[PDB]
């Protein structure tokens, strides 16, 4: 997150590190067993980390568990980022309490304008490399589609959008990838791509969680 605030420990208590190693992407608790990623994050050995603050520190209320199954969309393209999503389920439910908590599924897409709230652990700098300990947090409103298509011509789906600033200075940035963009108590975004960070005329863009609800729940009820 470039350009954002310290959120304060647990107070994003749906948003994931996902660890293999070392933190490399985060995603969003859906329910007890399941996590909503990007599909571009996908890799073997995942274990998500729910209840973090500070990634390289345990502070008391982490809960680590491995991953079951990963599930890519079925129609992800990796070549234009179309279908951004997956789905991860854990070896056993997690503990619900203040501090880990789900995120609930859009009932409808949200409109141009709607302020929403971007969190994660990647990059704070749009020009070199600086990465944090504790978890980021932008404000950033929905930009018109035709604001988002305007800024990259040719490349934005009607599974996309863009939220941000069109000035620059506030984005999401790499390692922040699968992380939630939540607008209205609903998770209506995932981290997906951008050009470069934080950059005039580029804004953040985003997979449009409210197209992928059945999906998601037909999934989950399946797995
Ligand atoms: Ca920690």
């Known amino acids: 997150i470039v350009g954002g ?4 420990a647990n107070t994003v208590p749906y948003q994931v590190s996902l660890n293999s190693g070392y933190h490399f992407c985060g995603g969003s608790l859906i329910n007890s067993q399941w ?23 345990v502070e008391g209320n982490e809960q680590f568990i491995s991953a079951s199954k990963s599930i890519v969309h079925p129609s992800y393209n990796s070549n234009t980022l179309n279908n951004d999503i997956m789905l991860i389920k854990l070896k056993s439910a997690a503990s ?3 501090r880990v908590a789900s995120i609930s599924l859009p009932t409808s897409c949200a409109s141009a304008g709607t302020q929403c709230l971007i969190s994660g652990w990647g990059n704070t700098k749009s020009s070199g490399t600086s990465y944090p300990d504790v978890l ?5 409103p929905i930009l018109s ?3 988002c298509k305007s800024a990259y011509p040719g490349q934005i789906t009607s599974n996309m959008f863009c939220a941000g600033y069109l000035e620059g200075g506030k984005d999401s940035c790499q390692g922040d990838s699968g992380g939630p963009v939540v607008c209205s108590g609903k998770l209506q975004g995932i981290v997906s791509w951008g050009s470069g960070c934080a950059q005039k005329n ?9 197209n992928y609800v059945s999906w998601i729940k037909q999934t989950i009820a399946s797995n």
């Open 145 to 147: 589609d035709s604001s």
């Open 5 to 8: 605030y310290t959120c304060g």
């Open 96 to 98: 619900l309490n203040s």
């Open 202 to 210: 580029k804004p953040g863009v985003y997979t449009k969680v409210c």
């Open 35 to 57: 996590v909503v990623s990007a599909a571009h994050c996908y890799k073997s050995g995942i274990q998500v980390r729910l209840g973090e603050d500070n990634i390289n520190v």
């Open 136 to 140: 980021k947090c932008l404000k950033a």
